Design a protein around this ligand. Structure first.
Ligand SMILES: NC(=S)Nc1ccncc1
Ligand SMILES: [Cl-]
Ligand SMILES: [Mn+2]
Ligand SMILES: [Zn+2]
Ligand SMILES: [Zn+2]
Length: 454
């Protein structure tokens, strides 16, 4: 009546057999889970990775958070130990409800969360931790350095050890040579009661997977990928400020918003409570948000399967229309894989080949168009050697790799081939087409992929 909880998302309990290969399992559940945006995965009962750490030696810098619906917050980019944060967090929850923490029902924290973010006369602020792994604070999973016990070595090479799943081969994001620490390295999250993550989708519409190591549960809301734009239209009406253009990736604006508001406007929404030892997985372009029930510790990582490759291209196109910055060049990643075709998995090779074929036909068309605009001079250019901030289209901010237009009039500036009219005022004959590969270089790269795929 005040808050009507959305229906529960799917929950999976795979056998040890199904659980063996994470990528095969995810592909199996995909037709179900992609209809709901998020899903939960319960490992087999004995799969229990050793969590061990000293609570006094792990230090981190707290972030502070105000809890107001529709208020703008910026995406992440004093000092507590894990012990002193835990003491703060438990005392906060205990004093808020005048109860012992394990007696506060999850139903009630959820109802209360949505009450307090909507009421203007309540200025509740909370603190939390969010960072990628480092020397002061490292993965909750076992890693190779210090001598390990025989049980830790069981879990060293697991696919569900989230340090590994970046650099596995059923994935496509791992052969990216370009550093993208923000995207392919695990993030660590220390929660407390009501600390919250705003509605968002992952960069390049990737998957993500989140493991709760220990502590009180984490409440999630998710929207399936097909409803992404309905959600965005609802957000535009109620909070147009979050949609003002922004000069950086470090400046994206996000917000808290009641799922009942979305459901009233006919957006499908699902929920779950994630408990300790459980995985939540999010699918491409699935919006999600949530909040912590109490003191806890989670670890999460982005990833990309072969299924995702077409969506990845559509995402970069969508960023161009929006003038949004990219994290990496998609075409650069495709060509890097093509150049390693002999050592690729064969299903990977087949799917890359299909994306490459589309890339090449689009590039052919674009080059013909700029030639008819009077750009005649051309020269090969190794785009992958340029720092990213040195090869963005002046107009749409896309990261160039296949080709760009330059002019000696504006040294160092580039436009992609969609924005040739936007570089400067000189006539086209003064312009130059800079290209990574000729069409003749490209067709044999694709053929190598076809042979590997048979
Ligand atoms: N505190 C947490 S688990 N935050 C996030 C951030 C982004 N996506 C999912 C969870
Ligand atoms: Cl408030
Ligand atoms: Mn996320
Ligand atoms: Zn452009
Ligand atoms: Zn010029």
């Amino acid at each position: 009546s005040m808050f009507l909880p959305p229906p529960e998302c799917p929950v999976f309990e795979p056998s040890w057999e199904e659980f063996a290969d994470p990528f095969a399992f995810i592909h199996k559940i995909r037709p179900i889970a992609e209809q709901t945006g998020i899903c939960k995965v319960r490992p087999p009962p004995d799969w229990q990775p050793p969590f061990a750490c000293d609570v006094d030696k792990l230090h981190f810098t707290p972030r502070i958070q105000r809890l107001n619906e529709l208020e703008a917050q910026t995406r992440l980019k004093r000092d507590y130990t894990l012990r002193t944060f835990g003491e703060m967090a438990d005392a906060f929850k205990s004093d808020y409800f005048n109860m012992p923490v394990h007696m506060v029902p999850t139903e009630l924290v959820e109802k209360e969360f949505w009450r307090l973010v909507s009421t203007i006369e309540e200025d509740v602020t909370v603190e939390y931790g969010a960072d990628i792994a480092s020397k002061e604070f490292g993965s909750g999973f076992p890693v190779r350095d210090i001598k390990l016990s025989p049980e830790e070595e069981e879990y060293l090479d697991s696919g569900w050890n989230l340090n590994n799943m970046p650099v596995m081969e059923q994935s496509v994001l791992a052969h990216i040579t370009a550093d993208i620490c923000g995207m392919k390295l695990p993030w660590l999250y220390v929660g407390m009661c009501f600390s919250s993550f705003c509605w968002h989708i992952e960069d390049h519409w990737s998957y993500s997977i989140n493991y709760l190591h220990w502590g009180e549960p984490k409440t999630w809301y998710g929207v399936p990928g097909y409803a992404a734009e309905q959600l965005e239209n609802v957000m535009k009406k109620l909070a147009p400020e979050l949609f003002v253009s922004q000069p950086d990736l470090l400046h994206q604006l996000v917000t808290i918003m009641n799922p009942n508001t979305l459901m009233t406007h006919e957006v499908p929404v699902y929920r779950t409570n994630q408990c300790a030892g459980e995985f939540v997985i999010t699918f491409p372009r699935a919006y999600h948000s949530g909040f912590n029930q109490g003191f806890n510790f989670a670890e999460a990582v982005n990833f990309c399967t072969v299924d995702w490759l077409p969506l990845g291209r559509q995402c970069v196109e969508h960023y161009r229309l929006l003038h949004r910055y990219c994290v990496f060049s998609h075409d650069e990643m495709i060509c890097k894989m093509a150049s390693k075709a002999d050592v690729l998995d064969v299903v990977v090779a087949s799917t890359v080949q299909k994306d490459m074929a589309i890339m090449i036909e689009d590039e052919k068309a674009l080059r013909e168009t700029v030639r008819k605009l009077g750009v005649i001079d051309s020269e090969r250019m190794d785009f992958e050697l340029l720092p990213d901030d040195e090869r963005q289209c002046v107009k749409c901010k896309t990261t160039c790799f296949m080709s760009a237009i330059s002019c000696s009039c504006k040294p160092g500036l580039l436009v992609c081939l969609h924005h040739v009219k936007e570089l400067c005022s000189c006539p086209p004959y003064k312009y130059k087409l800079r290209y990574r590969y000729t069409l003749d270089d490209l067709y044999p790269m694709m053929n190598a992929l076809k042979l590997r795929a048979e």
